[PDB]
Coordinates of all heavy atoms in Angstrom, one line a residue:
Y122 N -21.2 3.8 15.5 CA -22.4 4.5 15.1 C -23.4 3.5 14.4 O -24.6 3.5 14.7 CB -22.0 5.6 14.1 CG -23.2 6.4 13.6 CD1 -24.2 6.9 14.5 CD2 -23.4 6.7 12.3 CE1 -25.3 7.7 14.1 CE2 -24.5 7.4 11.8 CZ -25.4 7.9 12.7 OH -26.5 8.6 12.2
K123 N -22.9 2.6 13.5 CA -23.7 1.6 12.9 C -24.4 0.7 13.8 O -25.5 0.2 13.6 CB -22.8 0.8 11.9 CG -23.5 -0.1 11.0 CD -22.6 -0.8 10.0 CE -23.3 -1.4 8.8 NZ -22.4 -1.6 7.7
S124 N -23.7 0.4 15.0 CA -24.2 -0.7 15.9 C -25.3 -0.3 16.8 O -25.8 -1.1 17.6 CB -23.0 -1.2 16.7 OG -22.4 -0.1 17.4
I125 N -25.9 0.9 16.6 CA -27.0 1.3 17.4 C -28.3 1.5 16.6 O -29.4 1.8 17.1 CB -26.8 2.7 18.2 CG1 -26.7 3.8 17.2 CG2 -25.5 2.5 19.0 CD1 -26.9 5.2 17.8
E126 N -28.1 1.3 15.3 CA -29.2 1.4 14.3 C -29.8 2.8 14.2 O -30.9 3.0 14.6 CB -30.2 0.3 14.5 CG -29.7 -1.1 14.5 CD -30.6 -2.1 15.1 OE1 -31.6 -2.5 14.4 OE2 -30.4 -2.6 16.2
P127 N -29.0 3.8 13.7 CA -29.4 5.2 13.6 C -30.5 5.4 12.5 O -30.2 6.2 11.6 CB -28.1 5.9 13.4 CG -27.3 4.9 12.6 CD -27.6 3.6 13.2
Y128 N -31.6 4.9 12.7 CA -32.7 5.1 11.7 C -34.1 4.7 12.4 O -34.1 4.0 13.4 CB -32.5 4.2 10.5 CG -32.1 2.8 10.8 CD1 -33.0 1.8 11.1 CD2 -30.7 2.5 10.6 CE1 -32.5 0.5 11.3 CE2 -30.3 1.2 10.9 CZ -31.2 0.2 11.2 OH -30.7 -1.1 11.4
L129 N -35.2 5.2 11.9 CA -36.5 5.0 12.4 C -36.9 3.5 12.3 O -36.7 3.0 11.2 CB -37.5 5.9 11.8 CG -38.8 6.2 12.6 CD1 -38.5 7.1 13.8 CD2 -39.8 6.9 11.7
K130 N -37.3 2.9 13.4 CA -37.9 1.6 13.3 C -39.3 1.6 13.8 O -39.6 2.1 14.9 CB -37.0 0.6 14.2 CG -35.6 0.5 13.7 CD -35.0 -0.9 14.0 CE -34.5 -1.0 15.4 NZ -34.1 -2.4 15.8
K131 N -40.2 0.9 13.0 CA -41.6 0.8 13.4 C -41.9 -0.7 13.4 O -41.4 -1.6 12.7 CB -42.5 1.5 12.3 CG -42.5 3.0 12.4 CD -43.6 3.5 13.3 CE -44.0 4.9 13.0 NZ -45.1 5.4 13.9
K132 N -42.9 -1.1 14.3 CA -43.3 -2.5 14.5 C -44.1 -3.0 13.3 O -44.0 -4.2 13.0 CB -44.2 -2.6 15.8 CG -43.5 -2.2 17.1 CD -42.8 -3.4 17.8 CE -42.0 -2.9 19.0 NZ -41.7 -4.0 20.0
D133 N -44.8 -2.1 12.6 CA -45.5 -2.4 11.4 C -45.1 -1.5 10.3 O -45.7 -0.4 10.1 CB -47.0 -2.4 11.6 CG -47.8 -3.0 10.4 OD1 -47.9 -4.2 10.4 OD2 -48.2 -2.2 9.6
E134 N -44.0 -1.9 9.6 CA -43.4 -1.0 8.5 C -44.1 -1.3 7.1 O -43.5 -0.9 6.1 CB -41.9 -1.2 8.4 CG -41.2 -0.5 9.6 CD -39.7 -0.2 9.4 OE1 -39.1 -0.6 8.3 OE2 -39.1 0.6 10.2
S135 N -45.2 -1.9 7.1 CA -45.9 -2.2 5.9 C -46.7 -1.0 5.3 O -47.2 -1.1 4.2 CB -46.8 -3.4 6.1 OG -47.9 -3.2 7.0
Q136 N -46.9 0.0 6.1 CA -47.6 1.2 5.7 C -46.7 2.4 5.4 O -47.2 3.5 5.1 CB -48.6 1.6 6.9 CG -49.8 0.7 7.0 CD -50.7 0.7 5.7 OE1 -51.0 1.8 5.1 NE2 -51.1 -0.4 5.2
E137 N -45.4 2.2 5.4 CA -44.4 3.2 5.2 C -44.3 3.7 3.8 O -44.7 3.0 2.8 CB -43.1 2.9 5.8 CG -42.2 2.0 4.9 CD -40.7 2.1 5.3 OE1 -40.3 3.1 5.8 OE2 -40.0 1.0 5.1
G138 N -43.9 5.0 3.7 CA -43.7 5.6 2.4 C -44.9 6.2 1.7 O -44.9 6.7 0.6
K139 N -46.1 6.2 2.4 CA -47.3 6.7 1.9 C -48.0 7.8 2.8 O -48.7 8.7 2.2 CB -48.3 5.6 1.5 CG -48.7 4.7 2.6 CD -49.8 3.7 2.1 CE -49.3 2.7 1.1 NZ -50.4 1.7 0.7
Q140 N -47.9 7.6 4.1 CA -48.5 8.6 5.0 C -47.4 9.2 5.8 O -46.5 8.5 6.4 CB -49.5 7.9 6.0 CG -50.8 7.5 5.4 CD -51.7 8.6 4.9 OE1 -51.4 9.4 4.0 NE2 -52.8 8.7 5.6
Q141 N -47.3 10.5 5.8 CA -46.4 11.2 6.7 C -46.8 11.0 8.2 O -48.0 11.0 8.5 CB -46.4 12.7 6.4 CG -47.7 13.5 6.6 CD -47.5 15.0 6.3 OE1 -46.5 15.6 6.7 NE2 -48.5 15.6 5.6
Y142 N -45.9 10.6 9.0 CA -46.1 10.3 10.4 C -46.3 11.7 11.1 O -45.6 12.6 10.8 CB -44.9 9.6 11.0 CG -44.6 8.2 10.5 CD1 -43.3 7.8 10.3 CD2 -45.7 7.4 10.1 CE1 -43.0 6.5 9.8 CE2 -45.4 6.1 9.6 CZ -44.0 5.7 9.5 OH -43.7 4.4 9.0
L143 N -47.3 11.7 12.0 CA -47.6 12.9 12.8 C -46.6 13.0 14.0 O -46.5 12.0 14.8 CB -49.0 12.9 13.3 CG -50.1 13.0 12.2 CD1 -51.5 13.2 12.8 CD2 -49.8 14.1 11.2
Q144 N -46.1 14.2 14.3 CA -45.3 14.5 15.4 C -45.6 15.9 15.9 O -45.4 16.8 15.1 CB -43.8 14.3 15.1 CG -42.9 14.5 16.3 CD -41.4 14.3 16.0 OE1 -40.8 15.0 15.2 NE2 -40.8 13.2 16.5
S145 N -45.9 16.1 17.1 CA -46.3 17.4 17.6 C -45.1 18.3 17.9 O -44.0 17.8 18.0 CB -47.1 17.3 18.9 OG -46.3 17.0 20.0
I146 N -45.3 19.6 17.8 CA -44.3 20.6 18.1 C -43.4 20.3 19.3 O -42.2 20.4 19.3 CB -44.8 22.1 18.2 CG1 -46.2 22.1 19.0 CG2 -45.0 22.7 16.8 CD1 -46.6 23.5 19.5
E147 N -44.1 19.9 20.4 CA -43.4 19.6 21.6 C -42.5 18.3 21.5 O -41.4 18.3 21.9 CB -44.4 19.5 22.8 CG -43.7 19.5 24.2 CD -44.5 19.0 25.3 OE1 -45.6 19.6 25.6 OE2 -44.1 18.0 26.0
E148 N -43.1 17.3 20.9 CA -42.4 16.0 20.7 C -41.2 16.2 19.8 O -40.3 15.4 19.8 CB -43.4 15.0 20.0 CG -44.4 14.3 20.9 CD -45.4 13.5 20.2 OE1 -45.7 13.8 19.0 OE2 -46.0 12.6 20.8
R149 N -41.3 17.3 19.0 CA -40.2 17.7 18.1 C -39.1 18.4 18.8 O -37.9 18.1 18.6 CB -40.8 18.5 17.0 CG -39.8 19.0 16.0 CD -39.0 17.9 15.2 NE -38.0 18.5 14.4 CZ -36.8 18.9 14.9 NH1 -36.6 18.9 16.2 NH2 -35.9 19.4 14.1
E150 N -39.4 19.3 19.7 CA -38.4 20.1 20.5 C -37.4 19.2 21.3 O -36.3 19.5 21.5 CB -39.1 21.0 21.6 CG -39.7 22.3 21.0 CD -40.7 23.0 21.9 OE1 -41.1 22.4 22.9 OE2 -41.1 24.1 21.6
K151 N -37.9 18.0 21.7 CA -37.1 17.0 22.4 C -35.9 16.5 21.5 O -35.0 16.0 22.1 CB -37.9 15.8 22.7 CG -38.4 15.8 24.2 CD -39.8 15.1 24.3 CE -40.3 15.3 25.7 NZ -41.8 15.2 25.7
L152 N -36.0 16.8 20.2 CA -34.9 16.4 19.3 C -33.9 17.6 19.1 O -32.8 17.3 18.7 CB -35.4 15.9 18.0 CG -36.3 14.7 18.1 CD1 -37.1 14.5 16.8 CD2 -35.5 13.4 18.4
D153 N -34.3 18.8 19.5 CA -33.3 19.9 19.5 C -32.1 19.6 20.3 O -32.3 19.0 21.4 CB -34.0 21.2 19.9 CG -34.9 21.8 18.8 OD1 -34.8 21.4 17.6 OD2 -35.7 22.7 19.1
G154 N -31.0 20.0 19.9 CA -29.7 19.8 20.6 C -29.2 18.3 20.5 O -28.3 18.0 21.3

């Protein structure tokens, strides 16, 4: 489990922790199941 890096990775992580990332309802359904 550790070897696949189960966490969000961004190319520019210098803006993190201050703006909530936008994700549409449909883009979200893809994570169901």
Side-chain angles (χ1 to χ4, degrees):
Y122 180 52
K123 190 176 195 159
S124 56
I125 69 157
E126 305 165 73
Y128 43 82
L129 203 68
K130 295 211 276 173
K131 287 267 199 180
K132 298 270 174 155
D133 191 84
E134 288 202 350
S135 64
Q136 285 299 312
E137 82 161 326
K139 62 172 70 179
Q140 288 291 64
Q141 63 179 316
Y142 297 142
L143 297 187
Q144 185 179 65
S145 73
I146 41 162
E147 196 197 300
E148 283 170 334
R149 176 61 188 77
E150 282 164 350
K151 263 149 188 153
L152 300 164
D153 282 345

